[PDB]
Design a binder for this molecule. Structure first.
Ligand SMILES: [Mg+2]
Ligand SMILES: [Mg+2]
Ligand SMILES: [Mg+2]
Ligand SMILES: [Mg+2]
Ligand SMILES: [Mg+2]
Ligand SMILES: [Mg+2]
Ligand SMILES: [Mg+2]
Ligand SMILES: [Mg+2]
Ligand SMILES: [Mg+2]
Ligand SMILES: [Mg+2]
Lengths: 46, 62, 362
RNA sequence: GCGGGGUUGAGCAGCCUGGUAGCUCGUCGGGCUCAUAACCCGAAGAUCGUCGGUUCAAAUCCGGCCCCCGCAACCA
RNA sequence: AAAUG
RNA sequence: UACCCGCAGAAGAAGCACCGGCUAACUCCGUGCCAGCAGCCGCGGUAAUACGGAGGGUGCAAGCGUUAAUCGGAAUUACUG
């Protein structure tokens, strides 16, 4: 178990909130397999 | 410097003498070096059966 | 007797659950060793140790004993259930029922103790919900969470109150603070503090991609705002002396300036604004008072900061639940309970998660 | 010590010789838009700091108390 | 006339 | 000592890396943007030949991989060019 090194510096008011506005809890959006962000130049096995 | 630690799980902590080898991790901003698993305080990976030499793991004798 | 039977069936399960959470065998072992130690006469020579040991033991004993009772009472009830059914003796049946009730109550008491051990666990709380980094989707998620919480509270019996709410410009809410009044409201909700992770196909995305948005809940108890007690004359040291420069014979002679000092803290306040010594003192006194308040606030801040830092050290572990609505599975990450009725959960069926969490002590 | 103030959530009016709660923003409900902003329509919202007094009647007049803002707090 | 995603 | 002769008995003697493309070698299970991998490009968000294990295979072999270092490929300082 290693410590996550957050980008908030010195947390003052609330830790969880701070974390939430951090890269660790950034939004993740998946790449489309079909649809908009869907075009693949080369396959996984291409 | 800052050094990556490959393999699943490690025993490292502060004041833990280790060997670094060079090799950058692409996704990490600023990491240019790997630790050597199985040199000095750094342990070999637990329960690895393939590429063991890369993770400092001895041949499981049977 | 069908309901009674059902209850009986439940109670054993409940007991088992309690045991699991407690780690009962370990506790028993501890009690044993401690008991042995107590029995040894050399322990009571060291007084501090002995009392501590005694304190440790008793609770353990209570925990074990109660558990034991639970095992037995149920069995007894079962035995008497047969009598109630086939032999058709009424009084006996009644007695059995009474026993069960008593036993149940006892069980509840132990479980209550386990759950609501903290100091502020009885008090009312402020649920604070804050949306994550996503944008609209995150806001929506936050809103949903808030709704769920509200549903839960109402179900429980608690009085909800939307203190503050920042709305999302498109949809959902950016942030919201909710006062949740009722007995053991904080103790019931404190576990929900943490980051909540939604996974679903975004309706606000034009691509319609799967999004993984986060949002924080943060439950804190309504602490009573303790009054700022005035300092004592004994704690202060008061110099009086001549002022800098000024103009005249009178000024040269008189000691209008006033330097008040705290003996505990080593803070000082001077004043020589006024001609009147008394006025200066009053001003100086006021200043001193202000300073003390500021010091108290600083102290409060510092302590809080430490706590915050500690919390941060958990990092990715602040993520307590995972609401996957694509594959339709809710999972609590710390306890490990799962449910496929996601919608139901959303609507406000958190008891299953919450109770477990409470039992765990996490 | 001498003045000025506290009025919908914000900033301002009225108090000017007691009895009429107005302006701009904001809030809420509709619309327009793929949606949001802007824009359009329609609503709501005030024990007038507090406590007493004078009155038929008080935001308004008088006093007390709490808070703010100026000023003045000197000749050695 | 017409800002943004 | 090299070297030669005799003795016994398969006897005392095989690992290391790799298998998405570049690049020779593919499947099942576990995990589910995590854990991890990675030279580049990238893989992993529940059917992963890319992670980890297994079976099968490929390449080297008393070595085999990794790191460092130099030239090469780089006609990418071009005298040849
Ligand atoms: Mg104003
Ligand atoms: Mg008038
Ligand atoms: Mg009136
Ligand atoms: Mg609009
Ligand atoms: Mg490869
Ligand atoms: Mg090939
Ligand atoms: Mg590999
Ligand atoms: Mg698979
Ligand atoms: Mg592999
Ligand atoms: Mg060259």
């Amino acid at each position: 178990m290693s410590r996550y090194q957050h980008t908030k510096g010195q947390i003052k008011d609330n830790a969880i909130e701070a974390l939430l506005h951090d890269p660790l809890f950034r939004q993740r959006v998946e790449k489309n397999k079909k649809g908009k962000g869907s075009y693949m130049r080369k396959g996984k096995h291409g | 410097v800052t050094s990556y630690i490959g393999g699943e799980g490690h025993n490292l902590q502060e004041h833990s003498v280790i060997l670094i080898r060079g090799g950058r991790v692409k996704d990490l901003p600023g990491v240019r070096y790997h630790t050597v698993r199985g040199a000095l305080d750094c342990s070999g990976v637990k329960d690895r059966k393939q590429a063991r030499s890369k993770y400092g793991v001895k041949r499981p004798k049977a | 007797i069908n309901p009674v039977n059902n209850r009986i069936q439940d109670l054993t399960e409940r007991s088992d659950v309690l045991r699991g959470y407690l780690d009962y065998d370990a506790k028993k072992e501890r009690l044993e060793e401690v008991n042995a130690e107590l029995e040894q006469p050399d322990v009571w020579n060291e007084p501090e140790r002995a009392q501590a040991l005694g304190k440790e033991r008793s609770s353990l004993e209570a925990v074990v004993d109660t558990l034991d009772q639970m095992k037995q009472g149920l069995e007894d009830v079962s035995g008497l259930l047969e009598l109630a059914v086939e032999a058709d003796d009424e009084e006996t049946f009644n007695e059995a029922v009474a026993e069960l009730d008593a036993l149940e109550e006892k069980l509840a008491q132990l479980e209550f103790r386990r759950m609501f051990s903290g100091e502020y666990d009885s008090a009312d709380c402020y649920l604070d919900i804050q949306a994550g980094s996503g944008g609209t989707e995150a806001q929506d998620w936050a809103s949903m969470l808030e709704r769920m919480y509200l549903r839960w509270a109402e179900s429980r019996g608690f009085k909800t109150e939307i203190i503050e709410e920042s709305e999302g410009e498109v949809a959902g809410i950016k942030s919201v603070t909710i006062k949740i009044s009722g007995d053991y409201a904080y103790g019931w909700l404190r576990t929900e503090t943490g980051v909540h992770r939604l996974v679903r196909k975004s309706p606000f995305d034009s691509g319609g991609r799967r999004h993984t948005s986060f949002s924080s809940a943060f439950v804190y108890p309504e602490v009573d705002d303790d009054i700022d007690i005035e300092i004592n004359p004994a704690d202060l040291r008061i110099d009086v002396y001549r002022t800098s420069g000024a103009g005249g014979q009178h000024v040269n002679r008189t000691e209008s300036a006033v330097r008040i000092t705290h003996i505990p803290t080593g803070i000082v306040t001077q004043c020589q604004n006024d001609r009147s010594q008394h006025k200066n003192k009053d001003q100086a006194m006021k200043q001193m008072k202000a300073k003390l308040y500021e010091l108290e606030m600083q102290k409060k801040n510092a302590e809080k900061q430490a706590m915050e830092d500690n919390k941060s050290d958990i990092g990715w572990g602040s993520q307590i639940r995972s609401y996957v609505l694509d594959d339709s599975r809710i999972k609590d990450l710390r306890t490990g309970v799962e449910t496929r009725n996601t919608q139901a959960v959303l609507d406000g069926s958190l008891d299953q998660f919450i109770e477990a969490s409470l039992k765990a002590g996490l």
